[PDB]
Design a binder for this molecule. Structure first.
Ligand code: FEC
Ligand code: FEC
Ligand code: FEC
Ligand SMILES: [Fe+2]
Ligand SMILES: [Fe+2]
Ligand SMILES: [Fe+2]
Ligand SMILES: [Fe+2]
Ligand SMILES: [Fe+2]
Ligand SMILES: [Fe+2]
Ligand SMILES: [Fe+2]
Ligand SMILES: [Fe+2]
Ligand SMILES: [Fe+2]
Ligand SMILES: [Fe+2]
Ligand SMILES: [Fe+2]
Ligand SMILES: [Fe+2]
Lengths: 170, 169, 169, 169, 169, 169
């Protein structure tokens, strides 16, 4: 289609992806608070670090949406599942990252269809980061499945720090 | 006694966290606009304040967990988009003021319920909200009183908030 | 005057009765939750104490009739739903304590009105409420000091309160 | 969807439960009067029918819990007091007849929402309401057709409903 | 058509029977593992539910024979092995829920084909499946909320389901 | 070695269990027909023998678990349906004979693998299969020698195998 139409179709998949990120941020941070509460430090820490990757994805999608003339969404897609036990956390996050990669690859095809190279490349890079998340989650899930409590005993009491504090305003 | 007290504090903690979640999205939205407008300094500071609200959201969640509750994932209120520069600063000062007002009452509940740790948490965050309020009031005043000469000075400034986010990848 | 002495005692009996009707709904509400949760012995004793409150309600009504009045059908206050197990026992203890205080005052009115039979009725029921209070305090103390290890013991226990309600059908 | 079908059944379950709570209070009110009038066998059967409704109210509440809902604690409508013996059996019949009509409709909703278990629960309770209906129409007919000649035979009969309520104390 | 009405019902009867054959092997597989882990009460009840499934399979076959059909000997789906304890009670609950959904559809086919006797069979068995579902949910809830503290209680319990097989030798 | 000795025995145990699963379905299929034909004593005894096979399948499964294995859920071969009464008893005699042959080879492996306990399990079960074999040969002999005169005697006889199999519901 025309210039405006081309931007609009891409703005639409960008807002769908971004809404998926917003969901991931809250879901992963929800699991983070639980892991932290259970005092599984290394697990709690990497979960937050992955939530921060999703915050960056959300921001990148937003910045591209503005560059195309659109308005970045503020609504998350789907609802957050709370109270998941450890094995459910890792099995569900693996499923969610898989679904994400599936959807983002369809979104990339749309960008290519609309002749938007820059946005297509954005999705490409982010899909590669989602793959890292998927592999991480699959591996934790696999050890939980195969090694049970004996694997968890080693994470118990480990540091949970994600580094120096959030460069903020105050 | 104890059980009732805990439940009442968890309720105000979640109300506050819900307000933090609103603020994160509202400020980041305005941050995208300022960046798009290329007012770097305003863009940068708006995001840094958004990261303060993220840390508030997280401190509330952690206290909620310590008290046996579940931290909410829904924001309070709707995000307003398309605000022009004068409206951004007038509204944000209004939001910060209202936030301090509500948190002050939340604080009071914590004291009535005998929860000193949660009261101290609110106290600390309220002091950080006062800093946000003052910042927004100040930008608002210079936009009211000086416009362009002031905005031309912000035009083209760096919008970097420092080194990139420690993440997983 | 005989009629005013009766009117005055019927008044406190209906207040008491309304409190019983509340307690029936409140404790049975909790019973449905404990059953759902499959905490058998706890569900069963909760319902057994509710049945005590039904009996109280019944005895208050029969004395009211004896005095020429009309037993009320409205419960005092409202029932709290969705209470978690720690809150169930803390609040139920609270409620029994408040009942004994209330009833201790109603008994005073009876004596003041020269009604020995109603006064003895309140005295007999008050001792039963003491038994309810001690029970709830005891469970409350176990859930506080032992938490999930105590509940693990109750998990899956029988929830029978004996033979089913003899009824009409 | 699954949650929509459960919510719709919970709604008609809560309506029915509110009708049961009302029947419990209405019929026990009459029981207090019949006992006061010293018509023991009428009073005893009235209380046994109220206990049937208590058991219906409990069954509905348990099924509501199984479906994830919250059982109501509010009765439907208002309790009429001070009814005379002819009015008692005339209105109890009307009420039983109206409950069977409503429950037949509630049953239809369960089926529409594909809830077999709840349909059979309504089905079984309707057959018990029918036994209540028949009892009230029969007593009502004797009071209307025979009056005092018939009541003379009930005067001073036993009112016991058997061994008293297993309770907590 | 008389023959076609029977044919359609026999088809849903064979489909339900195939689900029953599956449940039998799936539950007994988990029974062998729970016994292997020496959680007697859980192993025992798991095997008692399997035996309920054997009886449903048998009742379906008998109705199929009455209708002139041939009872299937293939199970629907495959058995999952090596499940961990939380997975056992999560899947069985899911499987009981799915069974109820289907049997209610099967019931509708019988009514449409005007087979009252078969519909009534499905109705009764659906009530039994609901008792199974409730059981699995309760165990999975205790494993979820109490973990090993609950299992410690079960460890080393008797696994007896009673007197042995009334068989031929 | 120890594991390989266990693995070889698990293999013949699972082969035996697959044969039991087949006999259960094969014999119950014939039980369904015999009942439909209303030859009760024959239908009763066929079901009783299938319950014996159920027990064998269970003992094999239990032994497999003891050796670290997974009990198979797949049956050996196919169920033949629609067999005439004479074919039923000739084939089952033939099936029992072959099982004893196979079982006797399986016992050998146990001994070669140094597994005394599993060899003794096969030994006790082989004695039961011989009881089954004699039974089936006896009936085939009456059908061959006496035909319809034998069946006239069994027609309308009781088919019960006892009170229902105690289950969960
Ligand atoms: C971008 C973006 C969004 C999307 C908002 C939108 O509406 O577009 C975004 C959204 C969220 C939201 C929700 C939450 C709240 C989640 C919850 O509590 O459930 C949420 C929570 C946090 N983020 Fe977040 N954010 N965010 C960054 C960017 C974005 N953030 C950058 C950058 C940093 C910088 C990290 C640093 O260096 O300290 C960063 C850090 C945090 C920390 C870590 C703070 C600490 O440990 O001190 C927490 C907690
Ligand atoms: C269930 C349930 C409810 C509904 C509460 C809810 O919110 O779901 C429930 C509600 C009430 C309410 C009001 C009253 C008060 C009636 C009035 O005074 O108007 C009320 C009254 C009575 N109930 Fe009650 N019910 N109910 C049982 C179950 C429930 N009942 C079971 C079971 C038994 C067992 C029968 C026995 O063995 O005595 C039992 C017995 C009684 C007796 C008999 C005491 C005695 O004779 O010693 C009286 C009076
Ligand atoms: C063990 C075992 C298996 C193998 C499953 C596995 O994968 O390990 C086993 C498998 C099967 C299978 C198929 C069927 C279905 C037959 C068919 O319809 O083809 C099958 C069918 C039945 N079993 Fe069964 N089972 N099972 C016992 C043990 C085992 N069961 C025990 C124990 C009892 C207990 C009876 C008692 O003494 O009370 C018993 C009884 C029955 C009854 C009798 C019901 C009644 O008369 O009420 C029927 C029908
Ligand atoms: Fe992402
Ligand atoms: Fe991701
Ligand atoms: Fe804040
Ligand atoms: Fe602020
Ligand atoms: Fe009481
Ligand atoms: Fe009490
Ligand atoms: Fe009723
Ligand atoms: Fe009724
Ligand atoms: Fe079944
Ligand atoms: Fe079942
Ligand atoms: Fe066998
Ligand atoms: Fe055999």
């Amino acid at each position: 289609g025309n210039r405006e139409d081309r931007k609009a179709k891409v703005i639409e998949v960008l807002n769908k992806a971004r809404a998926m990120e917003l969901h991931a941020i809250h879901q992963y941070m929800n699991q983070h608070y639980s892991l932290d509460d259970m005092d599984y430090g290394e697990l709690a820490a990497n979960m937050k670090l992955i939530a921060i990757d999703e915050m960056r994805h959300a921001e990148n999608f937003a910045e591209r949406i503005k560059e195309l003339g659109g308005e970045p969404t503020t609504q998350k897609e789907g609802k957050v599942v709370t109270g998941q036990a450890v094995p459910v956390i890792y099995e569900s996050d693996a499923d969610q990252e898989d679904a994400t990669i599936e959807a983002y690859s369809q979104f990339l095809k749309v960008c290519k269809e609309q002749g938007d190279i820059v946005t297509a490349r954005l999705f490409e890079r982010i899909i590669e980061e989602e793959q890292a998340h998927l592999t991480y989650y699959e591996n934790i899930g696999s050890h939980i499945k195969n090694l049970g409590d004996t694997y968890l005993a080693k994470i118990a009491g480990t540091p949970s720090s994600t580094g120096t504090a959030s460069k903020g305003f105050v």
